[PDB]
């Protein structure tokens, strides 16, 4: 007798299973650019999104909510309680304190390990079955606790870790060559930031060994020195941060694309942070970015790149200091 | 080892159950061309083919499997047995015999109405908890004998039914007003051919009704002609099967349309093909297109029409056309 | 022997125009949300940020950057100065002066006025042909300036208008209803903000006028108060604002949306604020939402739609306030 | 009086030349494909086609344009009439003479040179500033005579090449692997069809050169015989052909992609078929394909592989025979 039901004639009754639902945890800068980039690349059918800051989360809310004229997802969602959250294929944890200008991403963990002890029980006991992301940082680190905190097998444990410093290198690397980014091929392993790995045997154009061409390549006897472009990797987040105060679109994008394989079970290869111990010469239990199989059960295969001999004690350095921050830890 | 045992190390006993598949049933012209936009639109992550032509089915099949590079749907089969077909969550119907130049659509009914015979209660085996959308021609006696034999409850089974014929009308429309489709309203409503009806009453542009601003719209003696608008519109398939044989590309993006509403849950309103039943005046039970919200469990809402006494006239007697030419069959 | 030339040989020296570039003017929330959204649409092949705030600006264009592995957009720039500007199809300017509490909002217009008569004369004069799309507010006066200054004809110059005020009409519409905003139209004409117009009898779903079936909508005396709706809409940025302090995601897809038409030459109606002296009973020199068909040569015609008399005078009305304060502008 | 005039104000007229235009010459299943893969990619504001059977051709058109309301191009022409196509920025040749029960092959050749003898003349003259795509067979050929009679630079002279070629590898690559075409690398250079060159020393996984791990790769005495898959890339048109009478969609989809790169400039590198006079050894006028750099210009960059011994041997040999058969064409 309202006027809704003089105009539709209903015929179904009324329950509801999210087919294809994604979650943001932290809607910050990065939560948001996560956000913007899901829904524009229709990669949910329900975007659920959770926070502690109440008011700007209900505002975040509303303000996607006012754009769905132009979008094709038909449900936004946000709470404090994690039940808004149940069912979710994905879950993105982009909640924690973020780098001062100068700060280390180091000198995060403590603060950001008992905001994981918190979000990480809720979030698998509403979706026991998810997927989960990683990105608060320092992100290996972060990954490996979540890890740990939810029990899931590690296929199911995603960290973020070098997407962003191999898509910034290949970005800087075609800019220099004058091709798109898209064409330029090259590998950022092992940590996040301060001492990733860049390989310099499997970059390439057109699969062109950059490095057979030019023997110096990444060393100090390098005339072009390609080092300065690891290095430009290396220390971008703090030129951005310096300049901006954080940085936001970048990590958006790089994590709706590790979406984008997950949701469509697409099986592409990325730089992300897995379990690797066993691998790579590491026996402790450590995350660190290797070249991943990425499909609709998170990480199945890990490509077995063939590494210099410094190169793979870049790598066991950095699992021996992982390990011992980890060590100390406790749940 | 194999190659790819030496460059892959195995984490995750693959398992496939398939989340998002399509199947598309019949590899002609319709089907393929819905294939192609389904494709193209990112809906699926598995398109399932099938048909009766082995060859013909494994080419298509072979042809779409290699522009896979710039698609986003992992895995695309097919096979004459339906159990390439398990688990879709969309079944799309484009099998069966099409119109000859000149030939009625409901002079196809004998010929496919065998061949659903053969055909839906494989499907159903296969696919139990499915939507079907049935395209082939007469498609609004077809939807109703898909529904018949399939037992599948009314909101599962829709034909494509009037979606094109409004698609074409909006065009023309467009064309006349000097304005894009998508901002040109209008419906056809009633049977997919020779008597659909225009519901002249609900054209415009902006919320400004047309027929108010000039009365005589969709009568014989109005100066600019608006009725040959709905007469262009049925008289389409025959003047295009003239031209080129058949038709293809705009049903095709019609279906993608669909499918993408469905496998979204968008819930917009289509004007498709339903069992109206009990609705608009109507005591038999006969499909015919009216404005229908689509979503993940098909058709939930109707939405009902305002219509005159002779739009309300023809809709009877269209769906008595239909009526008289349905219980007198052989299944 | 560089590396570069090792690698590539050269057969074209380029002298770069570029063909669909976009500049946006202000990298605050709301220019960097158009930004990312005109970026995730693929609309440009290049795309200018301008901003007197140096290192924001920078920090902003390279996040941006190092995102280019996943965006189709090969060039983004930057600068204080105009030049990296030249040659755009369309310029979006977010730009305006910081807010001055408990001051006249004629102090604030004057004062916008001053930074316009910096910004104009530099866009036009690196971007002769360019189409610019005003959203600073307050939208219509500024669109007003925007054109004063430019000296540019009607139809090239843009505003905003009610663009966003009328997508949230059709979200919070199709939540009563329980349909896509995609599905339920409405528009929301004049001055953007408390003064809009709800055009009540444009209100339908499929063709149903809503005022027709349930003829007390929008009334006083409207038991189900649809006046709610409305102001919902218009409370809505201050609701907004109060809980995040600012609005950027709606603001951005819907002047994506516009920057779509231009650049694809859609012709598209939409509810935009365009000179219209000469239309709607208005005598004086005012920009007003109207519905507006837009493509590539910017606003080419306008809809005129049936006003209510008493629609017709908040227009007028409207007009004679704007009016009262450009008459008061030094220019 | 008119309804259109009641209906809108009209503010501007009629300086309408298209912006982003392409044509498709020829509409067989090839052409077709072209077009609805240019159409759902939004490439172009304008599509024009053309062919000499004047019937398929307008019912194809027609088929196209009911299709508008779920496009976004929003003008779609065609004619026998080479003034239909004036002002593309790219044109894209598909047509040519049907083969023949083995007759010579000069005799084949002739042929499509006397069929393009009038369609080059006649595209050129209507936008004398395009890039032209060529993609009939024989390719290489076909692409010098188009830039023959037509005098343009050859950076705006380009063939399909060994483009799909690749891309039907690296499918088969990812079938084998177990991983997305998108993430397997591997080049096939030179000459269309059986003389086509697949480079071993370039084919990869993350940067992993399968050569290194895997030393008899493209060897007889290859244990896995990974030489048959070039094999199969090299009979796939053969056997699709054989089977479903001809192939379309994956050319189709191919060339809307290299569309896109000269559309959107995007300077990826496509192994596509160029003049290549004074790079790779070779001596005579001859078109071959090579990783080239593709953009709003056509090829204005190529990549220099190091080729093997015999690799560079096949390549100059092939440019040997091309010349023969070129020396004797007829004008
Ligand atoms: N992995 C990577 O490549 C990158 C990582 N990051 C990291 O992302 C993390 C977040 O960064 P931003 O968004 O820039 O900072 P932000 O400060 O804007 O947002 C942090 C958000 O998380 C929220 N939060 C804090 N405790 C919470 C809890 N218990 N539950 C739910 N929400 C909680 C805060 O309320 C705030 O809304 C930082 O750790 C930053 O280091 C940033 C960029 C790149
Ligand atoms: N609903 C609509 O608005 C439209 C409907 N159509 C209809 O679509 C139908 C298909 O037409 P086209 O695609 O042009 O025909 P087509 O003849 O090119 O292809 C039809 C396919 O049906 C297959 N087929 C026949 N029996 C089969 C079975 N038991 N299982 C699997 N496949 C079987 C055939 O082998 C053939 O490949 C026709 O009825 C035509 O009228 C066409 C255009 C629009
Ligand atoms: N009409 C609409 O729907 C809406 C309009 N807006 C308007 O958009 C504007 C942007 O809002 P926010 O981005 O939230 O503000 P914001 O203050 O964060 O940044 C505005 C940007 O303009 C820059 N700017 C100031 N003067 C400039 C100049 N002379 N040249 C170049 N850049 C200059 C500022 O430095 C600042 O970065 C505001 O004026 C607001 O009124 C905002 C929301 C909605
Ligand atoms: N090399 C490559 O990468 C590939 C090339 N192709 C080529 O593309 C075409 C594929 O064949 P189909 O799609 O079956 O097309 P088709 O050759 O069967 O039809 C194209 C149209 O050209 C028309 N035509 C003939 N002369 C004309 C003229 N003077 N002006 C305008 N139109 C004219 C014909 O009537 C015909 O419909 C072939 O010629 C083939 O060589 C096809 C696949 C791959």
Known sequence: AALKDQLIHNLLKEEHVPQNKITVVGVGAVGMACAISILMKDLADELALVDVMEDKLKGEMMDLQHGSLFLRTPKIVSGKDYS??????????????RQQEGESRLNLVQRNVNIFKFI???????????????????VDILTYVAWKISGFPKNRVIGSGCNLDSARF??????????????????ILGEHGDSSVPVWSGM???????????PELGTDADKEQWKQVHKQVVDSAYEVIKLKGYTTWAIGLSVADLAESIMKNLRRVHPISTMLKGLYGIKEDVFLSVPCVLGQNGISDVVKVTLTSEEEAHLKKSADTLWGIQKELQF
Chains 1, 2, 3, 4 share one sequence.
């Open 84 to 97: 808004v959250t149940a069912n979710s294929k994905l879950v993105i944890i982009t909640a924690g304190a």
């Open 120 to 138: 990480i029980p809720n979030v698998v006991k509403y979706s026991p079955h998810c997927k989960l992301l990683v990105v608060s940082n320092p």
């Open 170 to 187: 290949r970005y800087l690397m075609g800019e220099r060559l004058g091709v798109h980014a898209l064409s330029c091929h090259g590998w």
């Open 204 to 214: 390439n154009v057109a699969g062109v060994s950059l490095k057979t061409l030019h």
